[PDB]
């Protein structure tokens, strides 16, 4: 909305795509890991619904 | 006693550099709005004949030499002291470069005031600061009304 210098905006929208993807699942091809504090990784939906009492 | 101290501290104008004498002469010219004769100079600095100082003063752009009587006067950049002249200058703008108000204060001591009433008249295109409404680089009002439509209608066009 304000003055975009056309460098931060691209990496920022990439960060939006990154976080919605990470919330969507965190078992992606491992270029990121994307945890949240503390050291335990943030547990996403494939982790919620995987094998071994993953909800199913 | 104060006059004695001033006379003791009165430095002779035969300085190390002539530029100090020139600056004092331009200060004394600027502080008087009227043209002044050569005798004012000869009384001001200890210099009598038409010297290199007087010749370079004649060659100076801000100083008008008078073939009539020898009156020397300051020359301002903006020769506008009326809103009509200001509007005609704004109409005669060949480029859209803004024009400063400090050199309009040169020549016209109450010029920012008239700028304020003409902006109140919607006669200009002003640029103003946010610390205060500041007379700055301005442009001719080729527009319609500056204060045209009210803020609620503006806000609902923003909603649009």
């Amino acid at each position: 909305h304000n003055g975009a210098p056309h460098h931060a905006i691209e990496e920022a929208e990439s960060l939006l795509q990154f976080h919605v993807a990470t919330y969507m699942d965190n078992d992606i091809a491992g270029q990121p890991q994307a945890l949240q504090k503390s050291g335990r990784p943030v547990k996403s939906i494939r982790a919620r619904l995987k094998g071994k009492e993953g909800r199913i | 006693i104060a006059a004695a101290a001033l006379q003791a501290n009165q430095t002779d104008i035969s300085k190390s550099h002539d530029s100090s004498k020139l600056l004092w002469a331009t200060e004394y010219i600027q502080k008087k709005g009227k043209p002044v004769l050569v005798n004012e100079l000869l009384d001001y600095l200890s210099m009598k004949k038409d010297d290199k100082v007087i010749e370079l003063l004649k060659k100076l752009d801000r100083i008008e030499f008078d073939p009539k009587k020898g009156t020397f006067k300051y020359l301002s950049t903006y020769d506008v002291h009326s809103p009509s002249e200001l509007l005609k200058l704004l109409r005669s703008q060949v480029t859209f470069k803004g024009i400063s108000c400090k050199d309009l204060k040169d020549g016209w001591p109450q010029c920012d005031e008239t700028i304020n009433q003409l902006e109140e008249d919607s006669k200009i295109l002003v640029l103003r600061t946010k610390k205060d409404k500041t007379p700055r680089y301005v442009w001719y009002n080729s527009g319609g009304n500056l204060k045209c439509i009210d803020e609620e209608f503006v806000k609902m066009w923003e909603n649009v």
Partner: protein, 226 residues
């Protein structure tokens, strides 16, 4: 050039003059008085900051008005696509007309009712079943509190008056659109605006030349026609 094109220029001018901020007015007046601009020359001419330049350029993107140009001599240039601007204005005025007409049609109908506790909107037909056992107050399902009628039925004439006054203001724009429909729609290019180059400065480092590379085989969005 075309007197109808001059009418278009004055039309855009009046649109920004009466319907946008003074900074927008100055920017668009500068770029019509002159031609396509490098940002540095404009910053020289207005003695402004990129922080101030930002939101203006952003909102002019948002209304689909200024056609930017990017080419290296990288040098930033700005112009306006005429059919893009015309159709954007056309969609804007049609959306204004339809939105204000439907808002006026809704606001001509009476209010409904307001519950001060839960602070929510209610309608008259929804309040038909909100009558209590004795038809005295309009009972609330949650708060068990009386419902009081809103103040928008007298806003019917206010929306009507706003529509009529805005229609009177845009009536020169409507007439200009009529004359445009009489005339022929023409499409701008960066090079077309280059053909009408009005020199702002004398030391512009960004050369105002359109110089595509050999084998410029790309078709780019916002830069081609069907």
């Amino acid at each position: 050039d075309r007197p109808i094109d001059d009418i278009v220029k004055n039309l855009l001018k009046f649109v920004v003059r009466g319907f946008y901020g003074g900074s927008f007015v100055l920017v668009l007046d500068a770029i019509l008085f002159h031609s396509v601009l490098a940002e540095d020359d404009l910053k020289q001419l207005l003695s402004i900051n990129k922080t101030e330049l930002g939101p203006l350029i952003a909102r002019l993107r948002s209304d689909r008005l200024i056609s930017i140009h990017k080419q290296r001599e990288e040098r930033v240039y700005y112009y306006v696509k005429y059919p893009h601007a015309i159709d954007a204005i056309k969609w804007k005025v049609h959306q204004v007309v339809q939105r204000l007409k439907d808002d006026l049609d809704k606001n001509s109908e009476p209010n409904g009712y307001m519950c001060p506790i839960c602070l929510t909107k209610y309608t008259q037909l929804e309040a038909v079943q909100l009558l209590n056992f004795d038809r005295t107050e309009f009972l609330c399902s949650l708060c068990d509190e009386p419902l009081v009628e809103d103040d928008s039925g007298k806003k019917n004439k206010e929306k009507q008056d706003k529509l009529n006054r805005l229609m009177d203001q845009i009536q020169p724009i409507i007439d200009s659109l009529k004359k445009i429909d009489d005339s022929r729609i023409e499409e701008n290019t960066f090079e077309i605006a280059l053909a009408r180059l009005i020199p702002p400065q004398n030391q512009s480092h960004a050369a105002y030349t359109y110089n595509p590379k050999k084998g410029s085989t790309m078709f780019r969005p916002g830069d081609s026609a069907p």
